[PDB]
């Protein structure tokens, strides 16, 4: 209902999303609070990606029943651009390749107003973001975000984009996949940096080990939130009950 | 101050060639007859220039050039075309390129046009590549109105040759873009890539016929075509693949029409509107971004 | 015992049609004139048959058929051709298919031939699809010698139509395979896939011309072509894409020549030799496995 | 030298592999012993994939200096098929898709002679291999190993293939990537099963958490084996010194 909504950034109420004849999300009740790293775990086919695309307003992910409230506003009639302008962003699992867009210009797209305006401060933010994702800024600034990059380079540049954007809500679809991750300390270093800045992360993942580093974890099984709360408790339940 | 061939209007302004790079030039029957000869062993790291300026009305800039590269030589040619007035212009280049054993030729042609489309840019290039030779070709027409672009290329490659041909175009108003390229991999292990990138707007007409023949064992090829359609533009993509050897392999991929939905939606998730996002994709596609 | 059309030699053996499925047939001027009419609302789950047997020398099995599907109807036609003698055979089918509003037609033709290549299988199919209609077509010729296959299809699609056309071939000896398919997406949101799979061995000659026209907003299409070349076989792949709307998008992908190196090497890492691994890939390609 | 070679399955001696003008492996000294899960860790560009392909004899991965001895035999003139017939196999990171090959027929390719030998046993091994990788045998046996499958389904079928094959040496390039792994208990269940059967696994990985479950770990940095030994020992070193 209306209980504790004043400290809630995102509120998904009994959401039903259909993909063709199949109902993928069968009543999703999920909330994201301010300054929280809330992870979403679940098996293949549970609706993890569908949920992330429905919140962002991606075409073809329209709810049949339910509502998505972001910042107190029901975003039912808002498009991707309008939802992004409210402080919500999505990092896809396989970030799109773009013909002829340099890294230095790509990282300026959607950049936070606190960096975006001053040029020498915006250019410094790019360096800090590329250095956080273990990429040499001078080796990548003039590279294109095209097919030429490795999947790990392109996904690290996408992680740097989330850093430059510094959103109120960052939806991260499988952030540790395809980056050639050395250890969870690499991704935790980025997660804690965004958290300290005031961001909330909606980390979508199938890897229980990644979810344990989050503040809260929700287990989605067949389009429904089965258990939610403590990361280690709901995590151990996920590994056991599948 | 550099081996360059300057042509203002239909006349040769300058013809200078350095040591190991013979540059000949004359005017006969209304055409310019150039001949570039790269001497055996000479690998020049600095690019040769070829400027073409046209400011007069009804100019027929016809240039027949022969480029010969001897065994183990190397050269890069940077052709620049400036046609800002564009009324009745006709730039026609007919080239015969012969790349010797283990020689390397690179060609880059950039065009800067004005906003009237009575220009005809018509390059015809015959390329013969010997064992171990390399041919790199790039035509870019993304500034002003193209007018009518009519490119024709035929490349015959022997053992261990490498070919890389590219076209970047930005067609507006009633622009016509015609591209017809054929690469014949006639020697063992000869490799090729034909790439086309571009955006077509308003009432433009694009025709891209790109062909690779894998006629020898271990010859490999790839055709990559991508063309954005905006407004009432019309595009035709004809990428032919011929294979006449069981150890040859050629692939082709093409995407024609509206911008990729994932690309558009990824930029809109950054706060850009559909028009800003499309503009970004199109600018990157044509090499502006 | 089922709505079927049997044709042994150049004569009609049987012509039986059930309730809601009118099957007419007659012999005129050396050709067979068939007419299939699926009545409005009739959605048949059991497939209609059409058997063609040829055991005599110099037979010209010419069949002109018209298939009409009324609004909300559904039918699947399974054509079976058995030509084991194959000395002077000629199977020619000229078809006019009209798929009504929200109707669904599926066609599957399978051929079983002997080791004589004096066979000419020549289907010409004109298909007209109304708002919401569906057309699924499959031609398989992987048994015995093809002889000369000459397929021609032209499909005109209106709003919300769905087209799926496929060809699986196995060409051996001096076999000739000719495929020419055009799909015109002339209505909003009309979707199409043209797929070609096959293997060409010995002295076979393959020509695959597959075309999609994205002429309306939200029309989408994809051409997928894959053809293995073994021996002295020759393949030509011509996949045309035309786009005449800024909200239309068509893609294509093709791989022609030797088997994919990663596929071959993955099977060889299982202990299979290069010939066993290639044989597995080719069998899977032609639908044997 | 010749010390302890009688209990060694694989012996890579000072191996130099060039990919174009670049030398990727600059003197690799690595050994794989009988009944051992020997993991290889390293950053991107270290030569992990190159090493796995050079041992298997993949075309384009020819050594310039050094030798690879497998089962006492120098396999310098042996092709992929000949090396596979000696008991060595490779599971690629992105297993190849195949047009028209069913799962039931794919899992019979290279299957161990202990199971291939009898139809009833071969059909039983295919069910336990698919059940081990958490796939419903009846839902996948008649599916094609083509583009139609998800990356997770195709890579789980590839792990099932390694099980059916039961090689003397199984080289596994990034076995936990692209499978939608619930936890390391899923991959460990498979690793222990192969180990109990007598297999040696040469697990190639960039993820330190995965290498901790192995018996021994070798750190490859810029084509050379820097540290080798205990999993937490060299694993912690890799996170710190990179």
Residue numbers in the entry:
A (entry chain A), D (entry chain C): -2 to 239
B (entry chain B), C (entry chain D): 28 to 316
Give excerpts from the publication:
The present study focuses on the ancestor SMS from the hyperthermophilic archaeon Methanocaldococcus jannaschii. The SmsC subunit, consisting of a RecA-like domain and a helical domain, contains all the structural motifs of the nucleotide-binding (NBD) subunits of the ABC ATPases (i.e., Walker A, Walker B, ABC signature, D-, Q-, and H-loops).
For the [Fe-S] cluster-bound structure, we chemically reconstituted the protein complex and performed crystallization inside the anoxic chamber yielding new crystal forms. Unfortunately, colorless crystals and further iron quantitation showed that the crystallized SmsC2B2 complex had no bound [Fe-S] cluster, but a sulfate anion bound to SmsC. SmsB and SmsC assembled into a symmetric hetero-tetramer consisting of two subunits of each protein related by a 2-fold symmetry. The first N-terminal 32 residues of SmsB are disordered and were not included in the final model. Upon dissociation of the cluster, the C-terminal extension of SmsC unfolds, destabilizing the asymmetric SmsC-SmsC dimer observed in the cryo-EM structure, and allowing the SmsC2B2 complex to open up to adopt a conformation like the one observed in the crystal structure (intermediate 2).
